[PDB]
Amino acid sequence: NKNSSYFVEWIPNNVKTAVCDIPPRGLKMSATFIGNSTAIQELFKRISEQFTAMFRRKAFLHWYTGEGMDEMEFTEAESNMNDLVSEYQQYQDATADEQGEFEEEGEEDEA
């Protein structure tokens, strides 16, 4: 509620809580944080610009096709990755706004 630009709103309330009796060694209390945020897509983009800089020239690739691999396999691969960056772009700034479907239906007006 104090950092709402850090959470998605079309997915209500974002967290599952669990409360265990048993902290780790030597310690009063703790917790793990795990999460997925729209930030993460930089990993996939990073890998992809760095892969493309090899593959556009087939550099290092001979070690790969040396074990019987086909260049199209990495084409199907990279396109699966750029579809993933496209998916976090579908969900990046996606609108929590309302939507509806409406009757095209009128009245005898007198007001």
Partner: protein, 49 residues
């Protein structure tokens, strides 16, 4: 009498290069596939009869 010899010629073949192909990987690939197609996934049908 003509006195003997006094004539050699040089052991010489000039050097050149032929059929040395410029086979560098600098433009070694051209192939592409798009990062998936455009789709809508955010909306309900609202099909209440």
């Amino acid at each position: 009498h003509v006195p003997g010899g006094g004539s050699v010629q040089i052991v010489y073949k000039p050097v050149d290069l032929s059929k040395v192909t410029s086979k560098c990987g600098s433009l070694g690939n051209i192939h592409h596939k798009p990062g998936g197609g455009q789709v809508e996934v955010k909306s309900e049908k609202l099909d209440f009869k």
